[PDB]
Design a binder for this molecule. Structure first.
Ligand SMILES: NCc1nc(-c2ccccc2)no1
Ligand SMILES: [Zn+2]
Ligand SMILES: [Zn+2]
Length: 177
C-alpha cells in the first residue's frame, strides 16, 4: 500500500485499503475510516464497485435529474466521494474551516459555508436530496467570489470550484456538451 495519505499526501497513522493500494488518515477518508474488522475497502473502491455493477450508470444524465435524486445510500456515497475529491486538492485548506469577514469595502455573506460544515451535514444525514449538498458546495465558492471581488485571491475560489464541478460531472456522469 501507499505510505502517504491519499487525500492530504502526508505520512502518519494510516489505514490501508484491502482492495487497492491507497492509504488514509482516519478523518481524511470520508466517511471516517470504519472500525470494523477485516477487510476494509476505501471509498474509491466502493464507488468503482457501484460503477461496475451497473455499467449503464456511466451513460449521460441531465444535471436537473441528478439534483432531484433522494439521498439513498448510493447517492450519499457519491456525495461523500465528491466532497473527498475536493479535499484532495491542497487549495481546499482555504475553504475547510469557518471563515470570517472583515475587509474594507466588503460585507460578509448572508449564509457562510465551509467544507467541514458540509462534511458534518453529510455525516449527520442532513441532506435529503443531492441538490442540498450541491447547493452548499457551490455556495462556498460563490460566497468567496462575491466577498473578495477584484482581489486576485478570488482566483482560489475559481480553482477549487473547477475541481468540484469536474468531479461532479464525472461522478454523476453528467451528459457531455
Ligand atoms: N472514465 C473512467 C470511469 N468512469 C466511470 C464511471 C462509471 C459510472 C458512473 C460514473 C463514472 N467508470 O470509469
Ligand atoms: Zn490525510
Ligand atoms: Zn481502495
Amino acid at each position: 500500500n501507499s505510505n502517504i495519505c491519499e487525500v492530504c499526501n502526508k505520512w502518519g497513522r494510516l489505514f490501508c485499503c484491502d482492495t487497492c493500494p491507497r492509504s488514509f488518515h482516519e478523518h481524511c477518508h470520508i466517511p471516517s475510516v470504519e472500525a470494523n474488522k477485516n477487510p476494509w475497502s476505501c471509498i474509491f473502491c466502493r464507488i468503482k464497485t457501484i460503477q461496475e455493477r451497473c455499467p449503464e450508470s456511466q451513460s449521460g444524465h441531465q444535471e436537473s435529474e441528478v439534483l432531484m435524486r433522494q439521498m439513498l445510500p448510493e447517492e450519499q456515497l457519491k456525495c461523500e466521494f465528491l466532497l473527498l475529491k475536493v479535499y484532495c486538492d491542497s487549495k481546499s485548506c482555504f475553504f475547510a474551516s469557518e471563515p470570517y469577514y472583515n475587509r474594507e469595502g466588503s460585507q460578509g455573506p448572508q449564509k457562510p459555508m465551509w467544507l467541514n460544515k458540509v462534511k458534518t451535514s453529510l455525516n449527520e444525514q442532513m441532506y435529503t436530496r443531492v441538490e442540498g449538498f450541491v447547493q452548499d458546495m457551490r455556495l462556498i465558492f460563490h460566497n468567496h467570489k462575491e466577498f473578495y471581488r477584484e482581489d486576485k485571491f478570488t482566483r482560489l475560489g475559481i480553482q477549487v470550484q473547477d475541481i468540484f464541478e469536474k468531479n461532479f460531472r464525472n461522478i454523476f456522469a453528467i451528459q457531455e456538451t
